[PDB]
Amino acid sequence: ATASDDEAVTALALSAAKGNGRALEAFIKATQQDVWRFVAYLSDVGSADDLTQETFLRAIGAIPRFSARSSARTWLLAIARHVVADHIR
Amino acid sequence: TASDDEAVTALALSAAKGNGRALEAFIKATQQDVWRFVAYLSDVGSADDLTQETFLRAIGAIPRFSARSSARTWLLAIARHVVADHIR
């Protein structure tokens, strides 16, 4: 529960959406690894660093509108997917 | 170019108020400056890590940015601390 984990991350996201910086920072720390793994499956490993950060830049942009209609991980990986879709080419 | 400094400071101010697109744009706008400064207080090899780590702290502090100085100075002040820690 692990899903206990998802819960924190969602919480971080919700606080970050309300303008809490230190929560945005921790959110990115908590999820960076997941985004990197996901992103590298869907292209290469050489791509992933660059795709990972693009994902976070969009995340940073969209987070003010995250309201937990889904878990923050799902929301974040949906963005990761758009970033990968764009990148081809 | 001072006008460029003004945009960056204006981005920082709007990001401090909870604007995510401002924060994103600010990071895009300053990433290169942070990397060069950091590459260079240490080395090209560690610059990526230190650039992240600067931005992570930047994200966490930005809500208390109020323009007592330019955002570029504020941000490079964070970068210093980051490099200082990396060599302690």
Domain that holds residue A77: 1-89
* Closest chain A residue by Cα to residue B63: A21
Resolution (A): 2.7
Decide if B60 contacts A24 (C-beta within 8 A). yes
With contact defined as beta carbons under 8 Å apart, do B49 and B56 qualify? no
A60–B18 CB contact, under 8 Å: no
- Which CATH number belongs to the domain containing residue B14 in this structure? 1.10.1740.10
Q: Does A33 touch chain B (CB under 8 A)?
A: no
Euclidean distance between CA atoms A7 and A30, whole angstroms: 12
Q: How many other CB atoms sit within 10 Å of the CB of residue A17?
A: 21
Q: How many domains does chain A have?
A: 1
**B17 contacts in chain A (CB < 8 Å):** 19
Q: How far apart are CA A39 and CA A60, in angstroms?
A: 17
Cα dihedral: B40, B7, A54, B82 (round 10) = 30
Cα–Cα distance measured from residue A72 to residue A56, given in angstroms and rounded to the nearest whole number: 13
The residues near B7 (Cβ < 8 Å, ≥ 6 apart) are B29
Q: How was this structure determined?
A: X-ray
Residue with token string 């981005």: B11
Nearest to A25 among B18, B24, B56 (CB): B56
| Closest of B74, B22, B83, B73 to residue B52, by C-alpha | B83
CB-CB under 8 Å, B56 with A28: yes
